[PDB]
Amino acid sequence: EAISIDLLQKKGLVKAVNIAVDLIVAHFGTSRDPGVKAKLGNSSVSPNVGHLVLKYLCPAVRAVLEDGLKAFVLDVIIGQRKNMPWSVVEASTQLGPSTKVLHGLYNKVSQFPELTSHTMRFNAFILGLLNIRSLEFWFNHLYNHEDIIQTHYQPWGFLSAAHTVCPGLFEELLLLLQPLALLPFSLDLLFQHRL
Amino acid sequence: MARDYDHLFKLLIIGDSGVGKSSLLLRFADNTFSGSYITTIGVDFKIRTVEINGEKVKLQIWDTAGLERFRTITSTYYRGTHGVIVVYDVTSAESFVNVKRWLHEINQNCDDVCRILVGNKNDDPERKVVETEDAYKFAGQMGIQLFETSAKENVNVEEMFNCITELVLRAKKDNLAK
Numbered sequence: 257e258a259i260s261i262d263l264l265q266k267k268g269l270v271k272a273v274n275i276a277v278d279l280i281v282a283h284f285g286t287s288r289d290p291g292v293k294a295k296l297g298n299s300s301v302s303p304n305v306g307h308l309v310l311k312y313l314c315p316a317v318r319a320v321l322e323d324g325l326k327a328f329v330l331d332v333i334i335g336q337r338k339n340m341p342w343s344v345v346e347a348s349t350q351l352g353p354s355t356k357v358l359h360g361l362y363n364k365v366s367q368f369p370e371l372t373s374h375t376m377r378f379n380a381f382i383l384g385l386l387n388i389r390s391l392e393f394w395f396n397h398l399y400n401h402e403d404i405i406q407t408h409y410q411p412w413g414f415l416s417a418a419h420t421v422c423p424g425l426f427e428e429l430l431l432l433l434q435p436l437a438l439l440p441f442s443l444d445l446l447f448q449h450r451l
Numbered sequence: 452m453a454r455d456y457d458h459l460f461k462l463l464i465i466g467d468s469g470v471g472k473s474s475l476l477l478r479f480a481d482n483t484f485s486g487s488y489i490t491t492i493g494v495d496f497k498i499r500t501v502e503i504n505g506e507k508v509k510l511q512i513w514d515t516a517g518l519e520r521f522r523t524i525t526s527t528y529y530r531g532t533h534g535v536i537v538v539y540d541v542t543s544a545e546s547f548v549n550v551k552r553w554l555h556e557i558n559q560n561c562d563d564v565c566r567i568l569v570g571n572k573n574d575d576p577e578r579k580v581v582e583t584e585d586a587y588k589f590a591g592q593m594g595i596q597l598f599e600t601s602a603k604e605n606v607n608v609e610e611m612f613n614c615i616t617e618l619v620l621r622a623k624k625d626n627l628a629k
């Protein structure tokens with residue numbers, strides 16, 4: 257019953273997130289003035305926080321969501337569907353207690369006519385998670401939905417193998433993400449579009 | 452050696468307002484000190500990497516608010532924490548008597564965590580009111596180590612962070628065996 261895993265390959269996924277969190281933290285500088293921090297966190301005032309999130313964090317996070325992601329899933333209601341990180345987002349942002357905001361964010365990025373692509377929707381979603389201090393929250397919510405994970409991932413995918421073979425490494429990932437929730441983000445969800 | 456860290460730990464700094472929590476972190480992380488007092492609102496943090504017995508260790512260090520009205524949700528401070536640095540001011544008897552409530556807060560929120568006790572502002576012998584021998588004896592009773600520090604003149608700060616990093620590293624190696 258053995259799943260084949262290269263731990264270094266899985267570490268690679270987390271490493272890219274680490275690098276992105278570091279760059280984003282470096283950008284917020286060492287000022288102790290909260291007003292300065294809010295400016296550095298505002299993508300209109302500081303386009304650079306938007307660039308960092310877009311070019312480093314979004315692809316590192318997408319790569320996690322892509323690892324061992326099934327090409328297709330067979331939906332009970334819809335039939336066969338192309339399966340993408342955005343599909344996993346839809347699955348893991350359904351309305352329930354304690355997830356109203358998360359669902360609202362899914363809905364609002366879904367409705368933007370400016371976005372025109374599922375990868376762009378995914379990116380706006382990440383920008384959104386940062387605004388509401390919930391990037392780690394969402395990841396942890398995703399992990400704990402074993403039904404979403406069995407649906408969308410192969411056993412060797414990181415989000416799946418996390419439960420079985422390498423739970424510590426996924427704990428690292430969540431820990432790495434934690435201080436993003438402390439940063440005064442104010443990101444335009446349409447930042448990618450406006451570039 | 453610029454390689455990927457071998458270990459990642461989260462450290463938490465707690466203790467009374469004004470005691471020098473931010474100053475300890477600022478000196479360890481940026482090697483700076485300022486006489487200025489800017490009270491911490493919620494949490495701030497610093498991410499640094501140290502070398503300890505050939506191992507590369509990444510430290511995500513959280514610096515909490517001392518004032519109760521600027522304290523954010525306690526659950527969030529503590530989640531995922533490996534080591535807690537408990538700070539009092541050797542110049543303030545009151546900051547010392549509150550150490551037990553901080554220790555209790557740790558117990559309220561953590562199962563298995565390393566701790567260390569820090570007496571900061573050891574800069575002014577004339578105004579020192581918490582004597583080493585009393586603090587040491589108390590530390591012993593709680594099974595934790597004591598460091599008296601000065602963020603002001605950069606004394607024992609590196610040593611202190613090294614200690615708690617070592618403790619946390621040893622707890623990790625021990626849990627792996629068991």
Ligand SMILES: Nc1nc2c(ncn2[C@@H]2O[C@H](COP(=O)(O)OP(=O)(O)OP(=O)(O)O)[C@@H](O)[C@H]2O)c(=O)[nH]1
Nearest residue numbers: 468469470471472473474486488491517572602603
């Ligand atoms: N003499 C002396 N003063 C210090 C030392 N460390 C900090 N201070 C001063 O004490 C004041 C408070 O320092 P902080 O580091 O902001 O204390 P804090 O625990 O972070 O305060 P809160 O954020 O409100 O909880 C500042 O004016 C510092 O310059 C020290 O080691 N020696």
Ligand SMILES: [Mg+2]
Nearest residue numbers: 472473490491
């Ligand atoms: Mg402070």
